[PDB]
Symmetry: D2
Subunit: 106 residues, 4 copies
């Protein structure tokens, strides 16, 4: 899908996690986020459609996703360890990464 | 693309890296590997077409990519730091991850 | 050294990075933070001096550092790639990790 | 402690993990390895006592530990998820990292 969609996914499951009750939910949600993130990856953001594919910006843009995915990956682990609360914390702190990118490229 | 393709990509650039001379090459090759890995991600391997999307296996399968991608990501950094040799080492040691997955799901 | 010290180090270089001008500075500062974090690691926080060494808390406490170190490591890479700005961003976003631990154990 | 010691620690718990039966053991052992690794970190290897602290080698040397610790961190997660076998696999594959450093600096 396109950015807007994967981003909608990202934001939806994030709220699902915040309202989540069981570790089952959190896991599934995070899993979708990973997918959404990995997909958002390939995309080229509007503010950067004039920049070349191998631009310092496009590279930093892609780097952001590697950070985001790495984080989800870990939060995932926590959910898998049954630790629902600290997994949610992990998800909440993800926002820092979401935001970060938004300033630079949204 | 489909697994076979992204896997071909993955294996080709790996050898490109082993035969690589300049940091420029390694970078580019690793970059391609990231793309191939991230894509291979979405795919569902043959040995697991009967297993549900949220199977312990399908999840572990996906996890391997997170490891692989993470590793490529760091190798990438090394290449960007001009450190061609240790980046190649990083690439060589990636194999451990490639193999790992192959036993369980290839 | 002891927590307070390594923590002071951590917070000092963090501001050094924020006021940093050249990539050389950022690198050096981040390098100090790595050392400081790696050291703070071994330590046992006050709120947890009654808890056993292998407590869920002492483990989570240790995990936080693994996250922090991991992040510093990557920020370091960026600095080495000459990318001073996104390296600073990487540092700023570290705080999320700093904070996270402080709620739970400070 | 000094390198030799942390290294002994590292190699001992590794074998403990290989002979390990319950997830409890694996966790505890890996935890010791982390401590041993993080400590080995600060040290200055013999082959590099003539090189300056900020040498390309001393830096690469330190980087190796960041890789090792990172890996241990993940194995740790697997143990915590009860997955004793794949955690042991994680541990076995760590050796690739152990070796790597030994060629360059042992
Ligand atoms: C889990 C974290 C994240 C969440 C929940 C999130 C959420 C959102 C949401 C809800 C939008 C709404 C606007 C729309 O698409 O119509 C948006 C847009 C956007 N996000 Fe994020 N985001 C996250 C991470 C990131 C990261 C890491 C990057 C950069 C690498 C990024 C780049 C963008 C961009 C470029 C847009 C503009 C899309 C457009 O053209 O409409 N986001 N984000
Ligand atoms: C850089 C590391 C890797 C390399 C170089 C690599 C390479 C290859 C190659 C050359 C094939 C050839 C057979 C073909 O596709 O026709 C293959 C197949 C396969 N690989 Fe990898 N691989 C890597 C990592 C991984 C990882 C991490 C996983 C698991 C998460 C994985 C899963 C598979 C599977 C399931 C197949 C079978 C594909 C098919 O149906 O043909 N690989 N791989
Ligand atoms: C780069 C991020 C971090 C910065 C800049 C930072 C900074 C600080 C500072 C300035 C103090 C001042 C109080 C003092 O020590 O006298 C402090 C205390 C403390 N920090 Fe951090 N911290 C960071 C990360 C962390 C992390 C990840 C943990 C947990 C694993 C942690 C645990 C603590 C604890 C337990 C104290 C109390 C120390 C005491 O007994 O005085 N910090 N931190
Ligand atoms: C878990 C993986 C590792 C294991 C099990 C391991 C194990 C060992 C063992 C058993 C020795 C025995 C010699 C002695 O100390 O008397 C040794 C030496 C050494 N290892 Fe490792 N090691 C590991 C990782 C590393 C890494 C990542 C580095 C580099 C960053 C490294 C650097 C060294 C060095 C420099 C020595 C020489 C110490 C001396 O002066 O005696 N090792 N290692
Ligand atoms: Zn973790
Ligand atoms: Zn690295
Ligand atoms: Zn990075
Ligand atoms: Zn993992």
């Amino acid at each position: 899908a396109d950015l807007e969609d994967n981003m909608e996914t990202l934001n939806d499951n994030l709220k699902v996690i915040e309202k989540a009750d069981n570790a089952a939910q959190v896991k599934d949600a995070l899993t979708k986020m990973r997918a959404a993130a990995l997909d958002a990856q390939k995309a080229t953001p509007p503010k950067l459609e004039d920049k070349s594919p191998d631009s310092p910006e496009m590279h930093d843009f892609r780097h952001g996703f590697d950070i985001l995915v790495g984080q989800i990956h870990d939060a995932l682990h926590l959910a898998n360890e049954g630790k629902v609360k600290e997994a949610q914390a992990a998800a909440e702190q993800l926002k820092t990464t979401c935001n970060a990118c938004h300033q630079k490229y949204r």
